[PDB]
């Protein structure tokens, strides 16, 4: 119907609660391995944020895996920053991490993050 | 860190993508039964929106059930409207459904929906 009312804060409240489930390890269903580091998460949140995870978890064989190993070139801190962004909308972008964050966002197919990294890099050159 | 940047549309985009997964029946992990009707959903989204589902899916026995049966007094249309609200932030509140929506929101422990129903009812009296 076109006569709905909308609760402005609903989407951010849902995301805040999903991050609280992640913090408490409630209903996490996959472990992402990035060389020596492991990250627990919810497949649905990963798919809703990343083109790469959407492709992985819609694959008829990979959708059933409980562990996904990322390319060894991926930086664990870069992945950690992007995982936090997925769950909070907040990106901890710093001079010391921007190259790793951009490379990880390109691999994960997160276009809006790639765009802001490119802009911040261009401003410093 | 307190130096993060934030992507304003991220939370609403995540919710839009979770509703697209629900529409395509991708990674739905529970069926909610409301008398003769069945509704497929994601446990994490239900828990992030409803105090009742949070209690159910954090219970050590109920967290493993693939089917949850609601109280026979719950109206399926009222539940359908609230499930759509969980996934879109949009509430299809009408004169013909407000009593069923309010009763369902009270049962599901969705306080913001209960509050707006009470306000709309008070304005019409």
């Amino acid at each position: 119907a076109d006569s709905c009312i909308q609760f402005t804060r609903h989407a951010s409240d849902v995301l805040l609660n999903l991050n609280r489930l992640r913090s408490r390890d409630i209903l996490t269903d996959v472990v992402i391995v990035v060389s020596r580091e492991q990250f627990r998460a919810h497949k649905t949140v990963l798919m809703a944020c990343s083109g790469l995870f959407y492709s992985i978890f819609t694959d008829q064989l990979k959708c059933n895996l409980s562990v996904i190993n990322l390319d060894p070139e991926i930086n664990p801190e870069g992945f950690c920053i992007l995982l936090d962004f997925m769950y909070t909308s907040r990106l901890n972008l710093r001079e010391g991490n921007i190259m790793a964050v951009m490379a990880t966002a390109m691999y994960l197919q997160m276009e809006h993050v790639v765009d802001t990294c490119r802009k911040f890099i261009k401003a410093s050159e | 860190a307190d130096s993060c940047i934030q992507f304003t549309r991220h939370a609403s985009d995540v919710l839009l993508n979770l509703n697209r997964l629900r529409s395509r029946d991708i990674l739905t992990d529970v069926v909610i039964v409301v008398s003769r009707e069945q509704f497929r959903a994601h446990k994490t989204v239900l828990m992030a929106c409803s105090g009742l589902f949070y209690s159910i899916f954090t219970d050590q026995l109920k967290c493993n059930l693939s089917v949850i049966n609601l109280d026979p007094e719950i109206n399926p249309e009222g539940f359908c409207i609230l499930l759509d609200f969980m996934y879109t932030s949009r509430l299809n509140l009408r004169e013909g459904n407000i009593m069923a929506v309010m009763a369902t929101a009270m049962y599901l422990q969705m306080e913001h929906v209960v509050d707006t129903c009470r306000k709309f009812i008070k304005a019409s009296e």
Partner: peptide, 5 residues
């Protein structure tokens, strides 16, 4: 909160 979207 609530608004007309």
């Amino acid at each position: 909160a609530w608004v007309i979207p």
